Write a protein that binds this ligand. Sequence first.
Ligand code: CL
Ligand code: CL
Ligand code: CL
Ligand code: CL
Ligand code: CL
Ligand code: CL
Ligand code: CL
Ligand code: CL
Ligand code: CL
Ligand code: CL
Ligand code: CL
Ligand code: CL
Lengths: 81, 81
Amino acid sequence: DNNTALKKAGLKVTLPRLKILEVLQEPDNHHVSAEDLYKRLIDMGEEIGLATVYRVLNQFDDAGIVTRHNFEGGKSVFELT
Amino acid sequence: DNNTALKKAGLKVTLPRLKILEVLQEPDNHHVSAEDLYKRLIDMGEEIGLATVYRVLNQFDDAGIVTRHNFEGGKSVFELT
Ligand SMILES: [Cl-]
Ligand SMILES: [Cl-]
Ligand SMILES: [Cl-]
Ligand SMILES: [Cl-]
Ligand SMILES: [Cl-]
Ligand SMILES: [Cl-]
Ligand SMILES: [Cl-]
Ligand SMILES: [Cl-]
Ligand SMILES: [Cl-]
Ligand SMILES: [Cl-]
Ligand SMILES: [Cl-]
Ligand SMILES: [Cl-]
């Protein structure tokens, strides 16, 4: 229940937050960059922009919903905590 | 005093942390991306890697030392809070 997950993390339920959570819950996207998560959203037929993806992920990090990893070469990925 | 800011923020004082705070305090770098901050450090003769810059900035975000902004196109800029 991602509605409950968002409430439990102190965030208003919105479509981008729900759809971003959904992608993070796909096996192939267990770890995902903001750019790849955006591409998956495009593939799904969503119209959620890349800045929104970044904003949501960074809010999720603050809320303790996701973990950020920073790799060599400035490449970054997110996963659910 | 940058040492105090770091200590009160709960972070060990290290040379990269101090150098990163110093770039953020330069008028021209009031707002800067990790990449641009890294470029400036290179210009200063520093040997701080890009992944370290990202890691330090994200720690600074969590400590409430910097504010993060996400612009159109996925551009991710920092400034001191
Ligand atoms: Cl898999
Ligand atoms: Cl697959
Ligand atoms: Cl696989
Ligand atoms: Cl998973
Ligand atoms: Cl894992
Ligand atoms: Cl990391
Ligand atoms: Cl690197
Ligand atoms: Cl893990
Ligand atoms: Cl100048
Ligand atoms: Cl100038
Ligand atoms: Cl300034
Ligand atoms: Cl590095």
